[PDB]
Amino acid sequence: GAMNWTVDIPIDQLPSLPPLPTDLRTRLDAALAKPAAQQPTWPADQALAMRTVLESVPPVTVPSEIVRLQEQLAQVAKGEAFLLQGGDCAETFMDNTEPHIRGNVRALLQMAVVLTYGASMPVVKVARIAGQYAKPRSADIDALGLRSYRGDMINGFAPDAAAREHDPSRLVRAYANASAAMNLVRALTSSPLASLHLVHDWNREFVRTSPAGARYEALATEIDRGLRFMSACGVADRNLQTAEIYASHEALVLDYERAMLRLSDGEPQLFDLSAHTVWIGERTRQIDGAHIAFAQVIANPVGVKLGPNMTPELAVEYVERLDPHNKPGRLTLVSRMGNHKVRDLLPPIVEKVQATGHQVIWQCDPMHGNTRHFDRIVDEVQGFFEVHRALGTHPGGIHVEITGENVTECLGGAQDISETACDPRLNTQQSLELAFLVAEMLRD
Amino acid sequence: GAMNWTVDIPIDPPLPTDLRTRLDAALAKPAAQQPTWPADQALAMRTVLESVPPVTVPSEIVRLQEQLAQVAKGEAFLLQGGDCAETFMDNTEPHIRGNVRALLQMAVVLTYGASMPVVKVARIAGQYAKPRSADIDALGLRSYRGDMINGFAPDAAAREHDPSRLVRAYANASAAMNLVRALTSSPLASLHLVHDWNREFVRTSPAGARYEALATEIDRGLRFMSACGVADRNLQTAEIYASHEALVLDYERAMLRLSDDGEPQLFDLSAHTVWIGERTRQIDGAHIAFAQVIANPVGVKLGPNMTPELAVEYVERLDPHNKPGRLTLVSRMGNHKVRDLLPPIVEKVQATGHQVIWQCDPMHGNRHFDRIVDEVQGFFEVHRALGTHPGGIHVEILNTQQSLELAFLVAEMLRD
Amino acid sequence: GAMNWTVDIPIDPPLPTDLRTRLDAALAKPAAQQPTWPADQALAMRTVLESVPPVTVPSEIVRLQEQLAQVAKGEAFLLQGGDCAETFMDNTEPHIRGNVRALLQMAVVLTYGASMPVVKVARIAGQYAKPRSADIDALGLRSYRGDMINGFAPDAAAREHDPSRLVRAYANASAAMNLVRALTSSPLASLHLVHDWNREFVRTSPAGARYEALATEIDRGLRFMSACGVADRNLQTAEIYASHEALVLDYERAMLRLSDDGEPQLFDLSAHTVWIGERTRQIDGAHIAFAQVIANPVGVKLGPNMTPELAVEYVERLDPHNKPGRLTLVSRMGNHKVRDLLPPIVEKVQATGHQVIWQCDPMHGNRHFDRIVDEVQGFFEVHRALGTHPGGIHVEILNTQQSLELAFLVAEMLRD
Amino acid sequence: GAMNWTVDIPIDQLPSLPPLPTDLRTRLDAALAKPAAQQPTWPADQALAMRTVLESVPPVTVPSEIVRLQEQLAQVAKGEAFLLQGGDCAETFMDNTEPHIRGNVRALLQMAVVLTYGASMPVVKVARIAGQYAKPRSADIDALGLRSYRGDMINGFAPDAAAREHDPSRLVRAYANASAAMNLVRALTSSPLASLHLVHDWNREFVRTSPAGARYEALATEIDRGLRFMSACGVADRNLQTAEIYASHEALVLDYERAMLRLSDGEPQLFDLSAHTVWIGERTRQIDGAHIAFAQVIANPVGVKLGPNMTPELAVEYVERLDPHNKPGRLTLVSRMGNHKVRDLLPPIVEKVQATGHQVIWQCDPMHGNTRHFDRIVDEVQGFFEVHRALGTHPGGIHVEITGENVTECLGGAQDISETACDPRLNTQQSLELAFLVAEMLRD
Numbered sequence A, D: 001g002a003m004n005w006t007v008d009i010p011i012d013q014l015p016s017l018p019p020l021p022t023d024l025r026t027r028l029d030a031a032l033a034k035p036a037a038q039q040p041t042w043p044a045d046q047a048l049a050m051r052t053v054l055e056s057v058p059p060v061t062v063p064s065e066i067v068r069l070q071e072q073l074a075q076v077a078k079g080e081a082f083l084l085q086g087g088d089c090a091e092t093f094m095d096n097t098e099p100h101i102r103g104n105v106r107a108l109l110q111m112a113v114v115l116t117y118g119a120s121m122p123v124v125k126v127a128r129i130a131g132q133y134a135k136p137r138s139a140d141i142d143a144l145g146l147r148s149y150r151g152d153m154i155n156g157f158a159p160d161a162a163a164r165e166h167d168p169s170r171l172v173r174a175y176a177n178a179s180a181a182m183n184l185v186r187a188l189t190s191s192p193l194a195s196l197h198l199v200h201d202w203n204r205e206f207v208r209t210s211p212a213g214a215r216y217e218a219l220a221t222e223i224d225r226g227l228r229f230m231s232a233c234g235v236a237d238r239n240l241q242t243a244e245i246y247a248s249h250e251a252l253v254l255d256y257e258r259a260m261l262r263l264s265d266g267e268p269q270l271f272d273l274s275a276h277t278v279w280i281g282e283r284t285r286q287i288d289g290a291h292i293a294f295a296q297v298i299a300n301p302v303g304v305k306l307g308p309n310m311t312p313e314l315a316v317e318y319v320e321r322l323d324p325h326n327k328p329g330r331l332t333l334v335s336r337m338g339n340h341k342v343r344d345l346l347p348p349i350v351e352k353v354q355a356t357g358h359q360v361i362w363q364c365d366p367m368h369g370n371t372r373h374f375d376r377i378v379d380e381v382q383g384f385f386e387v388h389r390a391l392g393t394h395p396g397g398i399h400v401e402i403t404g405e406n407v408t409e410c411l412g413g414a415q416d417i418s419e420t421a422c423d424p425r426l427n428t429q430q431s432l433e434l435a436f437l438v439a440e441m442l443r444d
Numbered sequence B, C: 001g002a003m004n005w006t007v008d009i010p011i012d013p014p015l016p017t018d019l020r021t022r023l024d025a026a027l028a029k030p031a032a033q034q035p036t037w038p039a040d041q042a043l044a045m046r047t048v049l050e051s052v053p054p055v056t057v058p059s060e061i062v063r064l065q066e067q068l069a070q071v072a073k074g075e076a077f078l079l080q081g082g083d084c085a086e087t088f089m090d091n092t093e094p095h096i097r098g099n100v101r102a103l104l105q106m107a108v109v110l111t112y113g114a115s116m117p118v119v120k121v122a123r124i125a126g127q128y129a130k131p132r133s134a135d136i137d138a139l140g141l142r143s144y145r146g147d148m149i150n151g152f153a154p155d156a157a158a159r160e161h162d163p164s165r166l167v168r169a170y171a172n173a174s175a176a177m178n179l180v181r182a183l184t185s186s187p188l189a190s191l192h193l194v195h196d197w198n199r200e201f202v203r204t205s206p207a208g209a210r211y212e213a214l215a216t217e218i219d220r221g222l223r224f225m226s227a228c229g230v231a232d233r234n235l236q237t238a239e240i241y242a243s244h245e246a247l248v249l250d251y252e253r254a255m256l257r258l259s260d261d262g263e264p265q266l267f268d269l270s271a272h273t274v275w276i277g278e279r280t281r282q283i284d285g286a287h288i289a290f291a292q293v294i295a296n297p298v299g300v301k302l303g304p305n306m307t308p309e310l311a312v313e314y315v316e317r318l319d320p321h322n323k324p325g326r327l328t329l330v331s332r333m334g335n336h337k338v339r340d341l342l343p344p345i346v347e348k349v350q351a352t353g354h355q356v357i358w359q360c361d362p363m364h365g366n367r368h369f370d371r372i373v374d375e376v377q378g379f380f381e382v383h384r385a386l387g388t389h390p391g392g393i394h395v396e397i398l399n400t401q402q403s404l405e406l407a408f409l410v411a412e413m414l415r416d
């Protein structure tokens, strides 16, 4: 109220839509009976009440967009497209603004044009956006003696006990922030921001304001000459596919994910309409756990993070559980090994999975296995490319944590660096620098 | 929190000098039909909305203005329709899908009848406020003024004006607009679906047999376009714009954003276009002054007491730069009066050299379906006699079948 | 030279072995209706034509075959029309422009009626030869057999068979095809022109009033497509293919070229498609054998003495690889006989699992306009009863107005 | 006949179409009363008879194509497109074959894609084709003691007196060969030959089989990466403007040009429908002569060759006679100075014409002022670019004599060279090499 600088917004208790089909709910119930790690500790009655609100709200995504994403990921799996996945390590309600969202959309589009030129194939753009509000925590108790911050969907960043309590009213706040962010992403991707014309000045600014600019000048000129040639051949914006940026987040809070399930076909299926695609993290990918089982039940394309403890046998079990119908690009295996280990640990995993006859996307996450040194991030992607080139497999994409702000979170870049509510992000300049360097890797 | 059924929000760059001066001067004018909640509580809720992602963006409003200019010039037709009042309880995917289908279906019929493009503007993503003649309703309760102000429930507590409804209205608007954007790029927007929609309408309508001939023509037209090699891939993605009555000045001012004709302007990014209603169009009032300060295309409702002189004053205040499409004059006269009252208004305004859209609202001056049809018929008669453009309709959607029926009847009017 | 009214031409890589064997074997078969000029003079004229630029190229013939496959499958309609006999004297820009306009106009009417694409094939750029029942005509002169063979002038000298007419025919064909290519990429090919063409037809036709309703529907269809945002820039450039009766084997063999389904084939590049007439379709004759050796889509005319057994033999010899669209069977039965004679032919051929185009030629078995219309009506009746595809018409263009009238009447048949 | 290995083809005497309008014929009569240099010496009665045949034949070109060419040449004049004009020095009836025409169409398309990439603007393609059958001659008597060969429209190449007699039956033979060539050009430009996809293998073959290949490898790779980027952005052939190749020749034989006049508008105008655009040569550009006057009367865009004797005053008189209505790109001034003289002689001409306020196309003909050394040809274009860069004017295009045959006619190129019925042409390899070098000039 007036005394503590907060407003209370009532949660309208509105009539339920018809329930999801009994057969699909029976399958979901069996999956959710499995143990789930890293779940909020709020009471069941509060969770149930807040899920019931979300069961009737307009979805963030629609099934036809998830079917189109699946078709494009099939192309990535077959080595005919590249996947660019990036955005905030953790979205916050406080930072869920037009300038921040516009910055992350600009960064993805800029990176995607550079990678398209380097790869000579289409780039599928998947933002970490409109739902990246939950994170696991290793530490029971943080450095201030407080219950850990678990992301805005669970508790508050503010270092005080009351803010840190798990409150499932944050499930509804998360949905409101997701739907508002996704509304703006849809608006921006049909706006003049999505014009290839703008890339000239973006890359020019990058080359001029980067100390290592002169290093990227030649490729930036090539891209510009490329764009001008397209235009000279008579290609106007009106003649190009509208920019498509898909939404993703880690499927961590199963209360949120289950309330955002909706029915679509030509057999009836559950779609998670909180996002287009979701991944399962290092700490929640237990083969007999609720997260993998939930991923088995939904129609969405899914990802699994593979850390340095991954065996080829377990990677193949993920393939059998999550791609039982052999649908290329339904499953993405996300390497996060560390730059010193990817060259040793990834090859035997890739061989054994390739031998299943299943076609996964191989995606590099060079952040989570490495504050963070830019050079080690670049070297893990380099190693990932080396592993695939050696094995004749497709280095399918990258998963990076970035922002279109000139923040100071990752060491290195041309800036010789000596606001995240989580891990360090590459700033606007470092994320573009990485795109230039991965474009060279795709070319070499 | 959850145990209080509340979301808790902690509340803890300047406008160009001239835009601050003009916005302050507009808001200091008398405002009719405003909620009676405390200024301090309203300021807190506006502070939440100051930083949220907008419902719309300026490039869409600039594009709408270009498409409305085409309407004003007699080269396109405006279809504006949707719920009389959106409610939080009906702000669901099936309801929004139904309203999007109805508009798309009505638009294809009108396009065929007019032989020109139809600009689609939904009453959606913020039609949460209404004026009321009487502050006490027939049950003796403070009047329900829409979910942005109070609750429909017939109890005094629910009818208290609640400024938290500014934020609930935005959340509900954002969620609706997200889905409208998703649906208009989805298979729902394919012209192929019109065959089955019109087939169902003709087969299940009492007066179906009456519309079978025009429905068959449209089908043969769609098939011809396909036969000439036109696939969905080769057509403009469907654009449905968002509109609502700009009534609650707390909400509209909170949703103002600055954007660059080179010079920074204020856009109301709660919608693409907004209108000013019959009870809030006081010429020296805050609503008309607020409409003068925003870049959006605007509408003004004109009822039976409208004079030609005052219609001209609206046009000169709201279209001062002579930009076709910037202003829509919405006739709502009643079927018995539109033929007598509208001609002298159209003549005086046409004489200024300003080019407004003339739009027919056949609801609010009349509900018997036949009287609604007759007001639009009268509107068309007025323009045909003056050689002016009957530019569009504004409807409240009449169930699904009656709204489709009206589209078929107005398509015949555009063909006459 | 000029003083002799002559152009003087000095006459001073092998086919794949199997194509040489097959072409030689086809040409050694008996050939009906051939010119009677000396072999040595014919060889000299063929030697000129061996090196000239082709009238057509293989990529166009491959594309036509794909579009005809669509006809065979019931997803497109074939319109084939033009002069009964092209003449050098009428091979002028105004005449060619008139024939191109008539085909484009008939095609848009048929497209609207069929609700599917229309493949346009002109009798043009080589329709310079005709067979004759009698070698001596009613004046007692050797029969005129078309400008590729002799002269129309009623004197014995003009009627002598003149092999120099092979080269004159090619020059006239090349010049016509050049202009057809120019006109189909010109403003003449814009759908916008159909409004005025149909308006003129309805206003100047005796039975105009009869076609006004369909002409208005087509106009409303065209305007709808434009209103949906479809400009000429967004449509397939108009494609008019070249055809003629493959009659003079000297001409067709000289215009053979080799092109690569991977393997080298012979294409007749005097045209896109050629047909074999009623007087030259001897099953063991050179014409049918020549049609078997070329890659082009081909047609065979079927008159009233056709049996189902022989129609099947044509299909098995000319479509040996089961390629839909490769073969067109052209019914020319007469309006009194098509309903009786065509059904058992269609049943036997459909049973083979080969997919031919069924095309109606309502001219050569009948000229009273009403009998021409009735043969096409009968053709449609036969296919409707069998559930087979009435795939197209082949007309001789009947003046301009009657050919348009027939398009309107067949459009109604496709709609029934 | 059978004894001398020739066939006589009768010229059908067919009915006349209506005459052209009396007012336009009265203007044409005044122009043609002026002296005409280098005209065939055949009798008036034979010329009249043969013109009358051509007055009723289908045109080679139509007015809407000439209106579209004029719009594109306006873009060249304004520095927003580049003009590529090339083909045979002299076409022959004997060589007017599918392989020869396909070779010249391939060469123009290949050169145009390279120049488009280098210029970063559209390239207008104008072939010397379907009518380049007449040439002037300086020499009354050639080296064999014979009346000179004047091109296939006038007399025969064969070194015998009878072949060398001027025979206006060759006007009709020229028309037949023009219409057949133009028919094939129209067919080829809508065929798979016109696909940008084919440029990869064309440039690859050029780089691999050129001894100076390694010199062009980098630009050939850039173009390939450019094309692949276009395709990766979703641009298919179906989404590009059909290739347009216009027809041109020197308007030399006024009997042919006048018989090919047709009427079109919105004031009635004479169009020369033997071609899209015609130029007037060095030896026939007399300011008070019939050729310039004929060019004044026709609607077609026109060119005038400017040799080393050209003064700025005379260049400005051409501008006033041929561009009286100030229509950009209606007039092309074609520099043919020689590599040693263009840097000295062109600047004062460009200055004086620029000062008229008229916008001509400046086109370089580096052949006719220089057998021919490749290096001197390259150096004249270099000098032309230098003159415009210095003056801030638009180096608008090139006019080159080329063939898609591996002939040995020009000295130099990567081939270190130590079939034309006239001047030496650049072979397939030299013409492509020149396009690569002019692309660098447009880039520098």
Ligand SMILES: [Cl-]
Pocket (backbone or CB within 6 Å): A093, A156, A157, B010
């Ligand atoms: Cl917070």
Ligand SMILES: [Cl-]
Pocket (backbone or CB within 6 Å): none
């Ligand atoms: Cl399953």
Ligand SMILES: [Cl-]
Pocket (backbone or CB within 6 Å): A337, A338, A339, A340, A341, A369
């Ligand atoms: Cl490591």
Ligand SMILES: [Cl-]
Pocket (backbone or CB within 6 Å): B039, B043
């Ligand atoms: Cl205030």
Ligand SMILES: [Cl-]
Pocket (backbone or CB within 6 Å): none
């Ligand atoms: Cl203003």
Ligand SMILES: [Cl-]
Pocket (backbone or CB within 6 Å): B333, B334, B335, B336, B337, B365, B366
């Ligand atoms: Cl009334």
Ligand SMILES: [Cl-]
Pocket (backbone or CB within 6 Å): C039, C043
């Ligand atoms: Cl022989």
Ligand SMILES: [Cl-]
Pocket (backbone or CB within 6 Å): none
């Ligand atoms: Cl075969």
Ligand SMILES: [Cl-]
Pocket (backbone or CB within 6 Å): C333, C334, C335, C336, C337, C365, C366
């Ligand atoms: Cl009969």
Ligand SMILES: [Cl-]
Pocket (backbone or CB within 6 Å): C010, D093, D156, D157
């Ligand atoms: Cl010769």
Ligand SMILES: [Cl-]
Pocket (backbone or CB within 6 Å): none
């Ligand atoms: Cl003039």
Ligand SMILES: [Cl-]
Pocket (backbone or CB within 6 Å): D337, D338, D339, D340, D341, D369
């Ligand atoms: Cl020199």
Ligand SMILES: [Mn+2]
Pocket (backbone or CB within 6 Å): A089, A090, A401, A422, A423
């Ligand atoms: Mn992270």
Ligand SMILES: [Mn+2]
Pocket (backbone or CB within 6 Å): B084, B085, B396
């Ligand atoms: Mn209402």
Ligand SMILES: [Mn+2]
Pocket (backbone or CB within 6 Å): C084, C085, C396
């Ligand atoms: Mn006939």
Ligand SMILES: [Mn+2]
Pocket (backbone or CB within 6 Å): D089, D090, D401, D422, D423
């Ligand atoms: Mn030359």
